[PDB]
Amino acid sequence: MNIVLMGLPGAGKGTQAERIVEKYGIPHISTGDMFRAAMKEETPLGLEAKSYIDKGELVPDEVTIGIVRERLSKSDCERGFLLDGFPRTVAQAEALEELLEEMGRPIDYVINIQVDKEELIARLTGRRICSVCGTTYHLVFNPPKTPGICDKDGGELYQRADDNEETVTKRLEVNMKQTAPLLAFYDSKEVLVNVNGQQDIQDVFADVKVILGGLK
Ligand SMILES: Nc1ncnc2c1ncn2[C@@H]1O[C@H](COP(=O)(O)OP(=O)(O)OP(=O)(O)OP(=O)(O)OP(=O)(O)OC[C@H]2O[C@@H](n3cnc4c(N)ncnc43)[C@H](O)[C@@H]2O)[C@@H](O)[C@H]1O
Ligand SMILES: [Zn+2]
Numbered sequence: 437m438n439i440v441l442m443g444l445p446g447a448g449k450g451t452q453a454e455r456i457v458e459k460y461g462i463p464h465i466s467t468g469d470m471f472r473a474a475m476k477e478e479t480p481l482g483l484e485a486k487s488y489i490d491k492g493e494l495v496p497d498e499v500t501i502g503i504v505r506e507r508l509s510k511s512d513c514e515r516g517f518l519l520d521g522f523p524r525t526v527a528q529a530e531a532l533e534e535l536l537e538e539m540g541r542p543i544d545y546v547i548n549i550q551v552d553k554e555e556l557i558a559r560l561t562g563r564r565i566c567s568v569c570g571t572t573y574h575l576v577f578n579p580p581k582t583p584g585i586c587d588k589d590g591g592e593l594y595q596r597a598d599d600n601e602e603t604v605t606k607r608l609e610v611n612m613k614q615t616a617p618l619l620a621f622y623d624s625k626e627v628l629v630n631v632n633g634q635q636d637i638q639d640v641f642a643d644v645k646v647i648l649g650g651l652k
Pocket of ligand 2: 587589
């Protein structure tokens with residue numbers, strides 16, 4: 437099961453990836469996670485990515501492709517894999533198509549999670565993450581028992597640095613522009629499948645399961 441999740445910022449890719457992971461046991465390769473790890477450790481790759489991430493811009497293709505190429509250089513990815521947030525440009529997708537052809541591991545499905553932009557903005561600006569355990573909540577859609585605090589550990593919830601309104605607006609603008617031709621690319625390859633992301637989490641995942649059930 438060689439799967440790409442795509443969707444505009446806030447579409448719920450990470451939420452669905454966690455479920456896909458737990459059910460099918462394929463590795464979750466998240467560029468967003470990998471960049472945030474590098475940023476937090478202040479590595480040279482981290483500091484390079486940060487200038488872009490903090491503005492809501494894409495990290496250049498050169499470094500991104502190269503970190504993904506080799507993440508996929510691993511024995512855990514022979515089962516299959518779940519790419520979350522890569523590719524997000526046609527040039528990324530074309531690099532990935534080549535690499536995977538050579539690797540014998542071409543993409544089965546690209547699952548595109550579709551959510552109205554108004555809701556996307558609400559999802560991102562209202563997201564709150566536990567500073568203690570990393571659990572994600574949402575002010576409206578999945579609120580804590582006590583506002584501002586994690587149910588599990590009493591930890592303070594915070595808003596991610598790139599989830600303020602102005603950075604969200606930039607992130608949507610950047611990704612809307614790149615998503616248009618990327619979807620055309622994967623549709624021409626006949627691997628694109630759309631899913632309605634504006635359902636409860638369990639129902640979105642139910643639709644994902646129908647798609648992937650055939651690849652168990
Ligand atoms: N390939 C690449 N090339 C270049 N640069 C790259 C790159 N990949 C990354 N980058 C760089 O790294 C940066 C960060 O990357 P990235 O994190 O990949 O940005 P993303 O696509 O903007 O959107 P998020 O990933 O923030 O959210 P998500 O869609 O996973 O949503 P979640 O599941 O949390 O859910 C969102 C919220 O909604 C809630 N929620 C989720 N599902 C539902 C639902 N079904 N109903 C109600 N609420 C829900 C959640 O609780 C949560 O509060 C990029 O901006 C770019 O700078
Ligand atoms: Zn917590």
